[PDB]
Amino acid sequence: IVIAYGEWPERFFTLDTKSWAKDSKGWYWKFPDVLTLYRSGFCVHVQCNASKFHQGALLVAVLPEYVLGQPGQVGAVLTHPYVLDAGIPLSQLTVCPHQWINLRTNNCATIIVPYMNTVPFDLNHCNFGLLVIPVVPLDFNAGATSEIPITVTIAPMCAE
Amino acid sequence: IVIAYGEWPERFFTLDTKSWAKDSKGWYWKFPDVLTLYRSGFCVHVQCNASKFHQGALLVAVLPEYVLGQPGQVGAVLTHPYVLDAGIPLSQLTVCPHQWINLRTNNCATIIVPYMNTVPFDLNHCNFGLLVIPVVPLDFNAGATSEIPITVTIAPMCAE
Amino acid sequence: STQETAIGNFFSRAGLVSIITMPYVNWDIDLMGYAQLRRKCELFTYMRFDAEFTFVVAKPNGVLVPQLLQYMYVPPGAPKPTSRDSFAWQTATNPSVFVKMTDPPAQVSVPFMSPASAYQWFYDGYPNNMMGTFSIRTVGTEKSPHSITLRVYMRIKHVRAWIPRPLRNQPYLFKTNPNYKGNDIKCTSTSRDKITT
Amino acid sequence: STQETAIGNFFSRAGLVSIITMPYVNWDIDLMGYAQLRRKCELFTYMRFDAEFTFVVAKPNGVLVPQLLQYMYVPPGAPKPTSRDSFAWQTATNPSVFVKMTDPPAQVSVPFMSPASAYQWFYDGYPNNMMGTFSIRTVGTEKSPHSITLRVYMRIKHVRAWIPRPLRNQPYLFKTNPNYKGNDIKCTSTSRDKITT
Amino acid sequence: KPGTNQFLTTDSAPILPGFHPTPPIHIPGEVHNLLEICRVETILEVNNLKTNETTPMQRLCFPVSVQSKTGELCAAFRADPGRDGPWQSTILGQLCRYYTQWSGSLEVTFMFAGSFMATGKMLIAYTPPGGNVPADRITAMLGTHVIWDFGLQSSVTLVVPWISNTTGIITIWYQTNYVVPIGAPTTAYIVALAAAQDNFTMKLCKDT
Amino acid sequence: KPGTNQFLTTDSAPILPGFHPTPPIHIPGEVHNLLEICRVETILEVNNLKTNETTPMQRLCFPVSVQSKTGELCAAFRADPGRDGPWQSTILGQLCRYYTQWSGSLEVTFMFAGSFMATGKMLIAYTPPGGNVPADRITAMLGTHVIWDFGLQSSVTLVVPWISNTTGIITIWYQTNYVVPIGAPTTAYIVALAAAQDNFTMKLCKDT
Amino acid sequence: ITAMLGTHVIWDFGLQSSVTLVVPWISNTTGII
Structure with missing residues (x-):
């Protein structure tokens, strides 16, 4: 587990599983839009199951106040993942809370994100984004499954 | 013994013996070049053996940051010893640590020089020079040895 | 020591923010002006301060x-x-x-x-x-x-x-929102000829 | 007393260091300018101080x-x-x-x-x-x-x-390093006619 | 006294005395020193070749293949964050351009991204500033080196002892050839991360 | 009050408040007062003749020979560091040109540089300021004098009682002729050193 | 200069008249003085 900025917040909704092909670019989700006054945290949980003959490396990281240059439950696909579609370079995305989904090693990553806003209480404002970037392209031998699924689980924490 | 500026540093390398003739001008060595990160002191020891029928007077003195107007183990020969080949007059060389090699009296002179630099730790920088100047020209009667040798011994102290 | 890189020192030494010529004028306050200071402010998300003109x-x-x-x-x-x-x-x-x-x-x-x-x-x-x-x-x-x-x-x-x-590397286009030139993306670092040197 | 010859007093009484005429200019700081102060500074090897222009x-x-x-x-x-x-x-x-x-x-x-x-x-x-x-x-x-x-x-x-x-007696040639005129060396003291007077 | 009516920039009457500003709140995550930012690993760009400008997504990793013979050089780069090159793409290198003099130690971490059934060995050697790049693996082994096998561990960290502002050069060698069973991909990629230690400092302010 | 907006040179806002300068170290050898410099012996130039300008290496000593008869004057010079002459070549004389008024005592040391088998005697006499140079050795002996023989001692020091800023004149006589055995050189040289005592002071600052 | 780096003894006959050099170990490719 990784706690965003070391501050605890004070059901199990499962979104659709995106398919990771050999030429995919990335995906991102906005919160709390994806689950559709307000004050609540979250517990993001991403799992990527694949055989031992596959290789790759994902990079899941939150990004508060992620403006672009309302997807919904389905999500969206980035166009230029090198500049994160917002001008900021991908090579320094590690500043924000993050995790690695190295397929040679553990295939699960969970992030605890508390409430981060300039007002104590808040439907038109999206707090933070959740980016999944295939830093290392996925490869396999012929005859294996051509698509490796990824599952995202969202659990509200300390809602009010 | 004379300790340079009254501060102790905190094998026996013998250099080649220069020959002192009746018309010589002087010699000088640079340190720590003559023994070829760095931090070390030194213990210079100069001896000049001659018979009781000779006369003369040497002046051995160190000079930190002695710029000219990389000799090596052999050494070098000054061109205008009156101005020390650097503009400074010889008559006030006594400010630096020094000793006299009066042949009528003792023929040995040892100088302890500690580390003197603007940084705690330092191959291209020479710390100090070692000048030997025949202030009083050497003279002898005919039939005696025409060259009186001088020996220099260097011993590193508190090296690191 | 470490006091030379604190957040207070990093945002000091008042510099030029705007030049006005009157050969009446209105100049609204906007820190997101010259690109030299805009990139420095854009490092963080929330900032609280006061100014002295x-x-x-x-x-x-x-x-x-x-x-x-x-x-x-x-x-x-x-x-x-x-x-x-x-x-x-x-x-x-x-x-x-x-x-x-x-x-x-x-x-x-x-x-x-x-x-x-x-x-x-x-x-x-x-x-x-x-x-x-x-x-x-x-x-x-x-x-x-x-x-x-x-x-x-x-x-x-x-x-x-x-x-x-994260900081910004692409050139700016507008003074209000971050669109870049999405057809001539400039890389961050320089380029070698072969990865051995 | 002895306070009149201390190192602090010996390096006081700010004097002219450079004159600039603009009938933009750049003037890099260099204490080794006028020969009056250069000879005084060259007495020591290492010096630490700050200035006030x-x-x-x-x-x-x-x-x-x-x-x-x-x-x-x-x-x-x-x-x-x-x-x-x-x-x-x-x-x-x-x-x-x-x-x-x-x-x-x-x-x-x-x-x-x-x-x-x-x-x-x-x-x-x-x-x-x-x-x-x-x-x-x-x-x-x-x-x-x-x-x-x-x-x-x-x-x-x-x-x-x-x-x-030791101090310096030969005239200066360059503002960066100490070469002298190695053919017309000037003696330090004056000259008598015979050493009896 | 002299020095009056002068506007020194590096040096006030309030305009609204009656105003009371909004009291602050406890927004989580606050930076007091910029050193807390330069202490997190970020992806290096070692594959800074001239042919990746068109497609800049391949510059974050360098490959290892079975075609390369044993005892052959794989990659090499210097360890100077200020200078241009691979260190331009990290937060430490970007923030070091705002300052003049920096000093302290560094650490570099690698991460294998190959299949689970691939094994081998790679030698990582760092030479101190002043000298020359090793010409042979046997020459490189005598110096400071770390033997890394990706069949057991997936990430190793090499710590640079000391840098200051004639730069240290790091190398990656081929201890053993890349072995792989039948039915697994023949190419693997390595990503390198860099970060500063707990004694990095900067002195003077500058503008990029 | 009168005396504002005036720039008196003999009398400040920092430009970089955020800068922290480098802390000092313990470089060995520090001068707190210039008196520690004027308290070391330095070579005098007594042989300041007009024929040594071409070859200035012979001005640091004056000779004694067997040709000179007994009871004859050898050398003489004044004891005024400020005035031009032999005292120009010493550090005390050079530093005294930066000041206006000086006072205190002085000391002068000689050093024989002849052979080990040469013996004799020389009389050194100093006359107080106000009077005349002695015309005979018998006249000089009545005043302040020190008998020096180089067959036993190799260096003697004569201390000047008091000088201030009509100057004292020192003399060196020939007590006995220069004797030497067969097989040894017939000429010897003497070097003179000068230094200040523990009560020398300077008052006003000047420029050379 | 090459010989000085090894085991050596500096002897001056102006002060001392006899010096002794001790060979560390011999056995029965021989040491040379």
Whole structure:
């Protein structure tokens, strides 16, 4: 587990599983839009199951106040993942809370994100984004499954 | 013994013996070049053996940051010893640590020089020079040895 | 020591923020002006501070002349002046400062002015952080006979920053939102010829 | 008493260090300028201190005119300005001072600025002790109509010296290293006719 | 005294005395020193070749293949964050351009991204500033080196002892050839991360 | 009050408040007062003849030979460091040109540089300021004098009681002729050193 | 200069008249003095 900025917040909704092909670019989700006054945290949980003959490396990281240059439950696909579609370079995305989904090693990553806003209480404002970037392209031998699924689980924490 | 500026540093390398003739001008060595990160002191020891029928007077003195107007183990020969080949007059060389090699009296002179630099730790920088100047020209009667040798011994102290 | 890289020192040494020429003018306060300071501020998401402005005035060619001026500050909610002889120049709710040209520059501060608790350089939703507006004119009913140009210097004091974010490398296009040139993306680093050297 | 010959008193009473005429200019700080002070500094090997400059400005013929100026200081590592309208004059990392000509002279200090622990007047090895650079210009987009000349006075405070060395008697040739005229060596003292008087 | 009516920039009457600003809140995550930012690993760009400008997504990793013979050089780069090159793409390198003099130690971490059934060995050697790049693996082994096998561990960290502002050069060698069973991909990629230690400092302020 | 907006040179806002200068170290050898410099012996130039300008290495000593008869004057010079002459070549004389008024005592040391088998005697006499140089050795002996024989001692020091800023004149006589055995050189040289005592002071500052 | 780096004894006959050099170990490719 990784706690965003070391501050605890004070059901199990499962979104659709995106398919990771050999030429995919990335995906991102906005919160709390994806689950559709307000004050609540979250517990993001991403799992990527694949055989031992596959290789790759994902990079899941939150990004508060992620403006672009309302997807919904389905999500969206980035166009230029090198500049994160917002001008900021991908090579320094590690500043924000993050995790690695190295397929040679553990295939699960969970992030605890508390409430981060300039007002104590808040439907038109999206707090933070959740980016999944295939830093290392996925490869396999012929005859294996051509698509490796990824599952995202969202659990509200300390809602009010 | 004379300790340079009254501060102790905190094998026996013998250099080649220069020959002192009746018309010589002087010699000088640079340190720590003559023994070829760095931090070390030194213990210079100069001896000049001659018979009781000779006369003369040497002046051995160190000079930190002695710029000219990389000799090596052999050494070098000054061109205008009156101005020390650097503009400074010889008559006030006594400010630096020094000793006299009066042949009528003792023929040995040892100088302890500690580390003197603007940084705690330092191959291209020479710390100090070692000048030997025949202030009083050497003279002898005919039939005696025409060259009186001088020996220099260097011993590193508190090296690191 | 480590005091040379603190957040307070990193946002000091007041520099030029805008230049105004009057051969009345309105200049709204906007830190997201010159790209040198915009990239430095965009490092963090939430920032809280106050400013301290200074107006050095002089005619072109540099010579000074004995003229009387009036710099007027407008809070976020107020009607901005629209003429040389409007009632805004006379209403007293919004303060103003009078100083002659042949005098030391007028120094004035401004507190942390926002309904929220910190400025937001990045807003994801739809409609907010206006800091005010300065108005400059030459006092008198007639027309001044001398052209003036003044440059405004601004400092930052009592700086607090939150939620660091990655820096920016692509060139800027607009002063309000971050669109880049999505067809000629420039790489961050330089380029070698083969990866052995 | 003995306080009249201490090292602190021996390096006081700020004197002229350079004269600049502008009928923009750059003047790098160099204590090894006028030979009067160079010989005094060359007595020791390592010296540590800070300076306090003062700029008295006036047009030729001595008369003063109401003009606004800008003296700009450049740290050792920075790009020096190369034109009257470069971005160096606008970057805020290197401080600057604004003062009108008809005013008391601008006094400003500068701390002990060196990566090492003390200045080195004599370096034996190959490549270091730069102290900065001052730039002077008349504020304004147009061309100033009045010629100016200013002279810079510099003081020395909190002086510490190490490793005394013999003084110098031969005339100087270059401002960077000590070559003399090795064919017309001048003796230190005068000359008698016979050693009996 | 001299020095009056002068505007020194590096040096005030309030305009609204009656105003009371909004009290602050406890927004989580606050930076007091910029050193807390330069202490997190970020992806290096070692594959800074001239042919990746068109497609800049392949510059974050360098490959290892079975075609390369044993005892052959794989990659090499210097260890100077200020200078241009691979260190331009990290937060430490970007922030070091705002300052003049920096000093302290560094650490570099690698991460294998190959299949689970691939094994081998790679030698990582760092030479101190002043000298020359090793010409042979046997020459490189005598110096400071770390033997890394991706069949057991997936990430190793090499710590640079000391840098200051004639730069240290790091190398990656081929201890053993890349072995792989039948039915698994023949190419693997390595990503390198860099970060500063707990003694990195900066002294003077500058503008990029 | 009168006396404002005036720039008195013999009398400040920092330009970089955020800068922290490098802390000092313990470089060995520090001077707190210039008196520690004027308290070391330095070579005098007594042989300041007009024929040594071409070859200035012979001005640091004056000779004694067997040709000179007994009871004959050898050398003489004044004891005024400020005035031009032999005292120009010493550090005390050079530093005294930076000041206006000086006072205190002085000491002068000689050093024989002849052979080990040479013996004799020399009389050194100093006359107080106000009077005349002695015309005979018998006249000089009545005043302040020190008998020096180089057959036993190699260096003697004569201390000047008091000088101030009509100058004292020192003399060196020939007590006995220069004797030497067969097989040894017939000429010997003497070097003179000068230094200040523990009560030398200077008052006003000047420029050379 | 090459010989000085090894085991050596500096002897001056102006002060001392006899010096002794001790061979560390011999056995029965021989040491040379």
